[PDB]
């Protein structure tokens, strides 16, 4: 038994892509990851409820 409080954690991933010299799609390492805002920050997110889901 526990309290029922649910948190949805959404991770946003912005990918950068280019075309190489041989026509193959190359994914850039400059792709960005955004976590939900927590304590004025978007780089660290800790689960603080009893239940959570990730998307």
């Amino acid at each position: 038994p526990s309290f029922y409080s649910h948190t949805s954690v959404n991770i946003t991933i912005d990918l950068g892509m280019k075309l190489s010299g041989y026509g193959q799609p190359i994914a850039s390492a400059l792709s960005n990851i955004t976590l939900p805002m927590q304590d004025n920050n978007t780089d660290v997110y800790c689960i603080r409820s009893n239940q959570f889901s990730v998307y």
Binding site: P1, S2, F3, S5
Partner: protein, 43 residues
Amino acid sequence: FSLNTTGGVILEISCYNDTVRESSFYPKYCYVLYNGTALKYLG
């Protein structure tokens, strides 16, 4: 039970005859209370 933990934090194990919502104040339902608010539901 009244618990005195490290750092002076006082925790209580309190049973009630009615369900108490989380972060609120008042078959037996038992709870762990930190500062008069329901911190953990035991069952």
